[PDB]
């Protein structure tokens, strides 16, 4: 004759870890990102639409279009370097971006592009620190 | 000429919140769970295979079968009460189970069934506390 709450704090961190494994194993993926940019060679990025939607309101609006795709959607991406997209996907799955000093401005360009608010601030705060 | 890490701690909590909204709005869903149990009326549960996979190694093994389903898979579920499955899905998306005292044993039955390790322990520790 009572109500009982249990909350595992570490759950989301653990679940995103298994979600990262599935992406790396190319399991349960429904989006492929074909990233072409200037003279850099073309790259493919398999992911889960929901994980991308949860980290990017730009990706959220992109995949929520009513008439659901039967399986795998291919997406063309231009203006973002493939290394930048790789780090933004990694952020979406791991909660962390590690980046070379020379990449920060290009990372923020794609962060603004995909409205990844938190990494826009992280890059902007870093650039001001370099004076 | 340096490497720079940024880590947003709250990211996974925030992303699971948007992931919960999408489930409740029935957006980007790829699994429906038709839960039938004894004399209880039948229920449908729309979810994302990856979120279910990340919280349950039983669901992970269920959906990782090579030949990917073109869109929406319907799953028949028996032996688990629909209120129990509702709370296990909610745990998978929110990291929390709130349950009536009279439900704990039935919750653990489904928690064992879907190998949700953390909620098995939470129920088992609760039942021992009631002597």
Numbering used by the authors:
A (entry chain A), B (entry chain A): 49 to 179
Give the text the authors published on this PDB structure.
In addition, we also report here the structure of a mutant form of the Keap1 BTB domain where the reactive cysteine at position 151 has been mutated to tryptophan. In order to gain further insight into mechanism of action of modifications to Cys 151, we also solved the structure of the Keap1 BTB domain C151W mutant. In addition, we have recently demonstrated that introduction of the C151W mutation disrupts the interaction of Cul3 with full-length Keap1 using a TR-FRET assay (manuscript in preparation). An overlay with the apo C151 structure reveals a change in rotamer for the side-chain of Arg 135, but no significant conformational movements with the potential to disrupt the binding with Cul3. Neither the binding of CDDO, nor the C151W mutation appears to lead to large conformational changes, and although we cannot preclude the possibility that additional effects are relevant in solution, or in full-length Keap1, the structures presented here suggest a model where dissociation of Cul3 may be driven by direct steric hindrance with residues in its N-terminal tail.
In common with related family members, it acts in concert with members of the CRL3 class of Cullin-RING-Ligase E3 ligases to provide substrate-specific recruitment for ubiquitination, and consists of a three domain architecture composed of an N-terminal BTB (Broad complex, Tramtrack, and Bric-a-Brac) domain, an intervening region (IVR) or BACK domain, and a C-terminal Kelch repeat domain. Keap1 is known to dimerize through its BTB domain, and models of the mechanism of action require dimerization for constructive engagement with the Nrf2 substrate. In the case of Keap1, the BTB domain is unique in providing an additional role in the sensing of oxidative stress.
